[PDB]
């Protein structure tokens, strides 16, 4: 049997070492994965890699390693697939723990815009949950926290976070995670996968894919929103994406909107992420 070292990063950014047989479907090391992290509630988590286009894939888990890296290096990424409509709902603490490391990671990065308050609320709860009670002896006037809260840091940011911190007195780590998560789950862009993608008009635009249906957004006016209801079928062929989109009682016949996407590996990538949504979420 011969065995590929495998690298995970993990949410708290350290990095995770195995091995697996060669031959090893995607779920053997994402089962090693999430028995490291002691991760019961695994649905709405898997593996990402960097294909040959630096594009990020999920790993299969039905599917071999090598026929999903291919020439790449064995190097994956532990994240969150599926974000809960309501992670109160979530039978376990340690479910909602992670969920929190990967939206902090979402909103740090850019990915998931934030008001300047609700930057604040949020890194108030994530500093609750891992230093406990505010204490003033780590926090002086001129006080920086080291947690990264947003994706652009500033002393205004950084006092508000320690405000609010002084509110949540006596809060354990599960009430502040469970806090962090009612918040983060309103933000419009909470579980938003982005594509870019050009209309039949060859316009620029960005497909969103989530638990409610499908976003496409034009600008910031005229979002335009397909619950999953609405969405009769999905379908690629070479460059292009087709959503079929139900007709209003008595419309006789369903429309067709197609979408150009950058090349055919994108857009069965987004026809892929789409039917597991869609699955995901019509059964969740
Ligand atoms: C996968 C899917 C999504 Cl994502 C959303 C709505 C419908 C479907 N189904 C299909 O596209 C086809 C046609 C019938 C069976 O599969």
């Known amino acids: ?51 040959a286009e630096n594009q990020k894939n999920w790993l299969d888990p039905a599917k071999e390693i090598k026929k999903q890296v291919r020439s ?22 340690i479910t909602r723990y992670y969920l929190c490391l990967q939206l902090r990671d979402d909103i740090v990065s850019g990915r998931l815009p934030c008001s300047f308050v609700t930057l604040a609320l949020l890194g108030s709860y994530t500093v609750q949950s891992e230093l406990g009670d505010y204490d003033p002896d780590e926090c002086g ?72 249906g499908l976003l496409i957004y034009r600008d910031r006016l005229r979002i335009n929103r397909f619950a999953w209801p609405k969405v009769l079928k999905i379908s690629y062929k070479r460059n292009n994406f087709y959503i079929k989109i139900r007709p209003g009682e008595f419309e006789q016949f369903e429309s067709t909107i197609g979408f150009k996407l950058p090349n055919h590996r994108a857009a069965k990538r987004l026809w892929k992420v789409c039917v597991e949504h869609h699955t995901f979420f019509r059964l969740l």
């Open 72 to 93: 790449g290096a064995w190097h994956f990424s532990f994240n969150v697939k599926f974000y809960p409509p309501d992670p109160a709902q979530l039978s376990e603490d």
């Open 141 to 212: 006037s001129d006080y920086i926290s080291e947690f990264r809260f947003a994706p652009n840091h500033t002393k205004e940011l950084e006092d508000k976070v320690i405000e609010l911190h002084k509110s949540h007195r006596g809060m354990t780590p599960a009430e502040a995670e469970m806090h962090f998560l009612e918040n983060a789950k309103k933000l419009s862009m909470y579980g938003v996968d982005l594509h870019h993608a050009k209309d039949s008009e060859g316009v620029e635009i960005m497909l969103g894919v989530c638990a409610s």
């Open 1 to 51: 049997p011969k065995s590929m070292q495998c690298k995970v990063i993990l949410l708290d950014g350290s990095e995770y070492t195995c091995d697996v047989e060669k031959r090893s479907r995607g779920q053997v090391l994402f089962d090693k994965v999430c028995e490291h992290l002691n991760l019961l509630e695994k649905d709405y988590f898997g593996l990402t890699y960097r294909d």
